[PDB]
Design an enzyme around this catalytic site. Structure first.
Site, PDB file in Angstrom:
ATOM      1  N   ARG A 144       0.852  -1.179   0.000  1.00  0.00           N
ATOM      2  CA  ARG A 144       0.000   0.000   0.000  1.00  0.00           C
ATOM      3  C   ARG A 144       0.887   1.226   0.000  1.00  0.00           C
ATOM      4  NH1 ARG A 144      -2.502  -4.396   1.079  1.00  0.00           N
ATOM      5  NH2 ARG A 144      -4.693  -4.397   0.684  1.00  0.00           N
ATOM      6  N   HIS A 147      -0.861 -18.975 -19.060  1.00  0.00           N
ATOM      7  CA  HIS A 147      -2.009 -18.714 -18.226  1.00  0.00           C
ATOM      8  C   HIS A 147      -3.184 -19.234 -19.019  1.00  0.00           C
ATOM      9  CE1 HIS A 147      -5.253 -16.807 -16.098  1.00  0.00           C
ATOM     10  NE2 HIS A 147      -4.387 -16.310 -15.232  1.00  0.00           N
ATOM     11  N   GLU A 191     -12.439 -23.590 -19.307  1.00  0.00           N
ATOM     12  CA  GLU A 191     -12.131 -22.891 -20.548  1.00  0.00           C
ATOM     13  C   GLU A 191     -12.835 -23.514 -21.730  1.00  0.00           C
ATOM     14  OE1 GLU A 191     -10.734 -19.909 -20.814  1.00  0.00           O
ATOM     15  OE2 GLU A 191     -10.224 -19.894 -18.750  1.00  0.00           O
ATOM     16  N   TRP A 195     -13.316   4.252   2.248  1.00  0.00           N
ATOM     17  CA  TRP A 195     -12.895   2.902   1.963  1.00  0.00           C
ATOM     18  C   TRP A 195     -12.782   2.087   3.229  1.00  0.00           C
ATOM     19  CZ3 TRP A 195     -12.047  -0.191  -1.981  1.00  0.00           C
ATOM     20  CH2 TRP A 195     -11.318  -1.321  -1.737  1.00  0.00           C
ATOM     21  N   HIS A 204      -7.426  -4.645 -11.057  1.00  0.00           N
ATOM     22  CA  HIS A 204      -8.530  -4.081 -11.811  1.00  0.00           C
ATOM     23  C   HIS A 204      -8.707  -2.590 -11.592  1.00  0.00           C
ATOM     24  CE1 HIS A 204      -9.357  -8.330 -11.595  1.00  0.00           C
ATOM     25  NE2 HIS A 204     -10.235  -8.187 -12.561  1.00  0.00           N
ATOM     26  N   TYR A 210     -17.950  -9.989 -11.380  1.00  0.00           N
ATOM     27  CA  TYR A 210     -17.728 -11.146 -10.552  1.00  0.00           C
ATOM     28  C   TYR A 210     -18.920 -11.397  -9.625  1.00  0.00           C
ATOM     29  CZ  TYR A 210     -13.062 -10.535 -12.334  1.00  0.00           C
ATOM     30  OH  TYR A 210     -11.974 -10.390 -13.177  1.00  0.00           O
TER      31      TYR A 210
END
Ligand SMILES: *[C@@H]1O[C@H](CO)[C@@H](O)[C@H](O)[C@H]1NC(C)=O
Ligand SMILES: *[C@@H]1O[C@H](CO)[C@@H](O)[C@H](O)[C@H]1NC(C)=O
Ligand SMILES: *[C@@H]1O[C@H](CO)[C@@H](O)[C@H](O)[C@H]1NC(C)=O
Ligand SMILES: *[C@@H]1O[C@H](CO)[C@@H](O)[C@H](O)[C@H]1NC(C)=O
Ligand SMILES: *[C@@H]1O[C@H](CO)[C@@H](O)[C@H](O)[C@H]1NC(C)=O
Ligand SMILES: *[C@@H]1O[C@H](CO)[C@@H](O)[C@H](O)[C@H]1NC(C)=O
Ligand SMILES: *[C@@H]1O[C@H](CO)[C@@H](O)[C@H](O)[C@H]1NC(C)=O
Lengths: 595, 201
Positions: A149, A325, A355, A457, A485, A495
């Site tokens: 952070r 990946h 997949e 937050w 993201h 999600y």
């Protein structure tokens, strides 16, 4: 007039198929062999593809959307008529691109250095994630958490603020109130006789569905707290929020790494069949063939020759860097492929099903007009991949295919260990996704002043998630940007919606399959009714409202949580007794640094 | 029972280059005893369909005029080369009559016609003012006017070049692979000349 737009879209689709194919093939080549040559080719193909889209989006403005009555034209054209970032002045546009590349760069150069020996630096991928996942030293975990952070979070704060301003101007230029509103447009439906959906409804549905699942989460929280207190005694309060650095990862996003501390019945074995694969000498081809059979058995098409001949199913042949990946690919022109450097393990067994589920969805809508060749919305693609994996994982399936011993005795304790692992993986992440998107939307809407960003937050992580960050960080920090993201410009809510779509789909298909038990014991691989039921939706791509796509598969025009709750109800039932002697829920006044 | 001229079917089927579908070839077949069974039983075609006389029954007939039309199309367009069909090829590149008397034969040429980097040599018509008559060939290339504003032969808003290339590549999926098509059209007219099937002992 519709006639001229129709002619134009037919012409456009004939150009678009080829340029998209050239770009897709260039990116593929890079991903199978990382080298400067392939980089140059994908970047060049990417740029002429974007230039084409810009020229066509310019032409597209001469076909007023309001004059077109047919949806296949109206939708393809509306998709092409978006002006994106071109609405920004040349200087604001290049500045935003500079900022976005800078934000990606800071996150990407993901290193911190240890004061114990300052020249020794850790990377996020190995290093910091390894500490956060495996160390039980409160102090090591805390430093690793804070160091991310500090350093990266703080460096991103001043870019994030300019980013928000430029994105809102872009969004306003395209007639959205803010950038959050721009992103919510991905769930918007209009002019379809009741299948319509307003952007503001995403918020109402997300908040409502979230409140309905809190009880599952509150009991999961209490259980996990009871167990983590024996790993981190003194440090964790019996009635409080868990410290963020003690949750198993850098962000407090998944509780999966806590499984080894919280395992309900540690005296019982798992169903990790990897050893069976080893004894039976399974290889990567066996893994993909078993996945193909799953799809064939339900009535879905088999894989194409291109899939079997061109896919990177194993490690690269030479000592090469490649993007191993796992991921599905659709290049256009019916060329379907996968990248996945498969190892012989249960995790890849399940990934192959995931997949390939994505490939089946891409194949199903292959016949759609080019600008409609995508899933119903951002959470559908993955919801389909997740149900294929979920089904592959059940003991019912594993013993039926000769992977798990037929003499395996599945009982009450086994089911509970399975479900807790799934709860840590699924339930434990919903408040993260929910909290983050709620926070970012308030930031983009201008509801949270720039000097109150971390203040809100932190308060939200304690009130919504029940996690308390151990360090009273200042407003010079931008802890959310410490997540991929947030710094790399991605929506995150997919999600939340994906998880709920997943359970609605699994329930609808297990009913089609006439399953007689609880949802977690369901295997629909032998059901052709379930296969056709899902297929009929998969084939639609974006040609129909996502709300209609759900009516067709699950009997609903919106998302629901009841199927999530039904999947986990027996875990919940168990947790309710486990917590009968303890506090359930959490206080937000306590912090690990309180004194 | 000696063997005579059997007609140059080898030049019809296993020809090097094929025509673009918008400008399909028209080859006349005459003065011979033609065996059609041998094409059928070659098992080398993906498609072998008759609207007329069956593939091995053609051998019991004489025709005076046999024509082989030929071209390259995409695999998903193969279904359009038939009586009663509509679509981009059937409407204006090549059309068979609803009362067609012959046979349509086609095969996958991905290993012959697809090229690395894309084979852009084959053309099809994307636009025409009106549909083609059966067996009509139109290879004119004026710029097509889509809008009402007169177009002075210049590509622009609502005015398009009528012919567009294909882009055949070795890893295109089936349906985007090139196919070679031969259409055998059979007529019975009045002339001292025939195309006949074989004599039997
Ligand atoms: C590396 O990428 C290049 C791109 O030209 C490809 O030709 C080459 O075969 C790849 N190397 C290996 C070892 O796959
Ligand atoms: C959209 O195109 C299809 C093509 O078959 C047509 O049938 C449909 O009527 C069009 N939509 C409207 C509202 O006309
Ligand atoms: C983008 O499209 C909108 C639609 O009205 C238009 O008003 C705007 O001027 C266009 N912007 C650019 C950069 O062409
Ligand atoms: C895919 O092709 C294989 C080839 O044998 C066949 O066995 C399998 O049943 C096929 N699957 C489907 C869905 O047709
Ligand atoms: C074991 O099965 C019995 C069946 O009566 C059930 O009562 C018990 O609660 C189960 N154990 C667990 C851990 O759920
Ligand atoms: C369901 O499992 C049985 C077990 O052998 C298998 O024979 C059957 O074929 C599977 N169902 C389908 C549709 O393949
Ligand atoms: C096909 O190719 C072979 C190559 O030997 C040739 O002999 C034959 O005449 C060709 N044409 C037909 C119709 O078989």
């Amino acid at each position: 007039i519709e006639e001229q737009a129709k002619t134009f879209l037919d012409f456009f689709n004939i150009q678009a198929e080829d340029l998209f194919y050239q770009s897709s093939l260039a990116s593929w080549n890079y991903n199978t062999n990382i080298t400067e040559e392939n980089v140059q080719n994908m970047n060049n193909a990417g740029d002429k593809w974007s230039a084409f889209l810009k020229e066509q989006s310019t032409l597209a403005q001469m076909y007023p959307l309001q004059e077109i009555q047919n949806l296949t034209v109206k939708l393809q054209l509306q998709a092409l008529q978006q002006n994106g970032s071109s609405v920004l002045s040349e200087d604001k546009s290049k500045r935003l691109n500079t900022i976005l590349n800078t934000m990606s760069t800071i996150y990407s150069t993901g290193k911190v250095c240890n004061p114990d020996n300052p020249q020794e630096c850790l990377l996020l991928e190995p290093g910091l994630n390894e500490i956060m996942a495996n160390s039980l030293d409160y102090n090591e975990r805390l430093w690793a958490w804070e160091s991310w952070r500090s350093e990266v979070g703080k460096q991103l704060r001043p870019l994030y603020e300019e980013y928000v301003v430029l994105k809102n101007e872009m969004a306003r230029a395209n007639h959205y109130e803010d950038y959050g509103d721009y992103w919510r447009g991905d769930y918007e439906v209009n002019g379809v006789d009741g299948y319509d959906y307003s952007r503001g409804q995403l918020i109402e549905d997300v908040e409502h569905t979230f409140e309905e699942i809190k009880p599952l989460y509150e009991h999961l929280h209490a259980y996990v707290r009871a167990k983590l207190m024996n790993a981190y005694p003194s440090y964790i309060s019996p009635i409080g929020c868990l410290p963020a650095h003690l949750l198993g990862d850098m962000w407090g996003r998944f509780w999966t790494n806590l499984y080894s501390l919280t395992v309900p019945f540690g005296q019982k074995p798992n169903i990790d069949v990897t050893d069976a694969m080893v004894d039976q000498a399974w290889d990567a081809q066996r893994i993909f063939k078993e996945a193909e059979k799953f799809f064939v058995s339900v009535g879905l098409p088999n894989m194409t020759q291109g899939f079997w001949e061109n896919s990177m199913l194993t490690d690269p042949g030479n000592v090469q860097k490649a993007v191993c990946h796992p991921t599905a690919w659709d290049l256009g022109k019916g060329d379907f492929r996968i990248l996945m450097c498969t190892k012989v393990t249960m995790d890849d067994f399940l990934t192959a099903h995931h997949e390939m589920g994505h490939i089946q969805y891409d194949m199903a809508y292959a016949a759609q007009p080019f600008l409609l060749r995508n899933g119903a919305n951002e959470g559908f693609h993955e919801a389909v991949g997740e149900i294929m994996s979920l089904s592959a994982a059940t003991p019912k399936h594993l013993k039926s295919i000769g992977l798990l011993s037929p003499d395996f005795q599945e009982d009450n304790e086994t089911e509970i260990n399975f479900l807790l692992k799934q709860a840590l993986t699924i339930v434990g992440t919903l408040p993260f996704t929910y909290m983050l998107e709620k926070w970012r939307w308030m930031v983009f809407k201008g509801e949270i002043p720039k000097d109150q960003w971390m203040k809100k937050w932190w308060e939200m992580k304690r009130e919504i998630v029940g996690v308390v960050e151990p360090v009273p960080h200042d407003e010079t920090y931008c802890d959310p940007a410490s997540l991929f993201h947030v710094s790399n410009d991605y929506s995150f809510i997919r999600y939340y919606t994906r998880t709920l779509y997943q359970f609605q789909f699994q329930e609808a298909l297990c009913q089609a399959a006439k399953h007689e038990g609880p949802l977690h014991k369901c295997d629909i691989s032998n059901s052709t009714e379930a296969g056709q039921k899902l297929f009929n939706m998969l084939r639609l791509g974006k040609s129909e409202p996502w709300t209609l796509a759900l009516e067709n598969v699950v009997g609903a025009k919106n998302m629901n949580v009841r199927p999530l709750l039904n999947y986990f109800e027996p875990l919940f039932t168990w947790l309710k007794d486990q917590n009968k002697n303890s506090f359930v829920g959490w206080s937000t006044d306590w912090s690990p640094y309180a004194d | 029972p000696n063997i005579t001229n059997l007609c140059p079917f080898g030049e019809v089927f296993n020809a090097t280059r094929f025509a673009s579908v918008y400008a399909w070839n028209r080859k006349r077949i005459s003065n011979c005893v033609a065996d059609y069974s041998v094409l059928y039983n070659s098992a080398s075609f993906s498609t072998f369909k008759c609207y007329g006389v069956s593939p091995t029954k053609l051998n019991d007939l004489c025709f005076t005029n046999v024509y082989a039309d030929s071209f390259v199309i995409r695999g998903d367009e193969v279904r359009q080369i038939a009586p009663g069909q509509t679509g981009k090829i059937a409407d204006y590149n090549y059309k068979l009559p609803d009362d067609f008397t012959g046979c349509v034969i086609a095969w996958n040429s991905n290993n012959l016609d697809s090229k690395v980097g894309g084979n852009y040599n084959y053309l099809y018509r994307l636009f025409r003012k009106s549909n083609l008559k059966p067996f009509e060939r139109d290879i004119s290339t004026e710029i097509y006017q889509a809008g009402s504003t007169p177009c002075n032969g210049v590509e622009g808003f609502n005015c398009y070049f009528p012919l567009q290339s294909y882009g055949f590549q070795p890893t295109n999926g089936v349906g985007y692979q090139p196919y070679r098509v031969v259409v055998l059209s059979f007529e019975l007219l009045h002339a001292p000349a025939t195309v006949c099937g074989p004599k039997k002992s």
